[PDB]
Write the structure tokens for this entry.
Amino acid sequence: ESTPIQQLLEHFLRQLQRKDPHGFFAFPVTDAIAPGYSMIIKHPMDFGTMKDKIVANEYKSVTEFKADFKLMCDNAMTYNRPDTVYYKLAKKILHAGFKMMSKERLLALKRSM
Ligand SMILES: Cc1nnc2c3ccccc3c(-c3ccc(N4CCOCC4)c(NS(=O)(=O)c4ccccc4Cl)c3)nn12
């Protein structure tokens, strides 16, 4: 019963989340885990939130999904200093996502239908 966009986004989310085996990005980061996080990060984002939005038909374009994904990675690159696992992983995932979900690839996908 799922729509074309939900099926695609779900694919993108699964592929990107594969790159986070430890589950750092799976659920909202808490201050208990990451002290002061909420003083640095105004607009938190995580994979679980994104998945809920997919399921709930809240994304009306792939561009909207990309904005949340980029927000999640940006947040990690903002809270964490460059020499940390979290900043490094966020950079890698962002780069992969940006290529996988490029405007040219999305145009090809749309045209194929
Ligand atoms: C995403 C992201 N961006 N910055 C961070 C960050 C910065 C400092 C410390 C931790 C993080 C984490 C992070 C988020 C979740 C987790 N867990 C993954 C497995 O399920 C339990 C929760 C971890 N794991 S953890 O590295 O083992 C950890 C570190 C500090 C305190 C507690 C923990 Cl559990 C780390 N994720 N994160």
Notes: The domain at 1-113 is CATH 1.20.920.10 (Histone Acetyltransferase; Chain A). Residues 22-25, 29, 33-34, 76, 79-80, 86 surround Y1Z (CB under 6 Å).
